[model samples]
Target: MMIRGIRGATTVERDTEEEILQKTKQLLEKIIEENHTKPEDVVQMLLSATPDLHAVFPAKAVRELSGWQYVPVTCMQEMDVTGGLKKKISVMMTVQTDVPQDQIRHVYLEKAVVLR
Candidate 1:
């Protein structure tokens, strides 16, 4: 078995902690749901938000989820690329599973869907 990576992203309407966390939670829930991933199977999660968002760390949303306290998560600022989308939050979840790389499903919700 090998580890696989799942990618997802979503955007918030504003820079409030509540909105950030809520949207992030929704994004993660879908990722977990679509991938049929168990919390324990997740190796780690890397999250990033655009520079315009400074209200909260997206990792807080993941940590507060049930059965996810032990999962390692980190948050960072997305690169300030010109013309890049604003108010966006992105996630990459790494999991230890036998699923082939080609079968992994990536999710992009809300305005972030334009990213792919």
Candidate 2:
């Protein structure tokens, strides 16, 4: 099987920990569902949040997912470029799969849709 990266991004209206966790979870769920991937298939997951969002580490959402306890997950701050998207959280999930690169699906949800 080959390895590929599945990308997804979402935005939260609020900076509260609740909103961050929920939105991050939503983005991850959509990526997993659309890609037909499971926690066991995941090699690593990298989450990035805009500098404006620091209510909590978005990695918490992934770590709390069922069967994701052992998945390698990390969190970082996104670049604060001028006019960059705000209140955003992005995910790059690396997984072992048979799917070809061209067939891999990437998701951009909510306000993050403009990013694509």
Candidate 3:
């Protein structure tokens, strides 16, 4: 009955659509699965990519998902930091869930775990 934030991130070895989407999809799926988020419970999804990543938009995963057309998805570019994680993508979601904040899962997969 309240809005909660779910976060997750992943990394790719290079700038390629396949790699980005592959990791992006994995990040989103893990977040959703672990959080038990339903399509209707997702209010908005914001995904950002590091400067070196330009192969695809993380929102593409949701855009192509069934019953997700109503969800507002945004893709953004992070400022080019001097030594930011390369080929990395991160996401934050505002969702309508009753799950307590302390119980929500935050996923950091692959090499992206170092970010936390």
Q: Residue 29 of candidate 1: its Cα lDDT?
A: 93
Give the per-residue lDDT digits (tens) of candidate 2, residues 38-61.
889999989999889878999878
lDDT of each: 0.90, 0.89, 0.83
Tens digit per residue, CA lDDT, model 3, 51-80 = 777777778777555677888888888778
Model 2 residue 60 lDDT score: 79
Q: Sorted on lDDT, highest at the top, how do the candidates line up? A: 1, 2, 3
Clashes of each: 0, 0, 0
Better of 1 and 2 by lDDT: 1
Give the C-alpha miss distance for residue 67 in model 1, angstroms: 0.5
| Model 3 CA lDDT for position 100 | 88
> What's the residue-level lDDT of 36 in candidate 2?
90
RMSD per candidate (Å) reads 1.0, 1.0, 1.4
Q: Give the TM-score of candidate 3.
A: 0.91
User: Tens digits of per-residue lDDT for model 1 on 5-108?
Assistant: 89999999989999999999999999888899998999899999989999999888876678998898988888989998889999999998787888888899
lDDT of 3 at 18: 80
| Cα-based lDDT at residue 115, candidate 1 | 78
The CA lDDT at 42 in model 2 is: 91
C-alpha-based local distance difference test score of model 1 = 0.90
List clashing residue pairs in candidate 2: none
lDDT of 1 at 20: 96
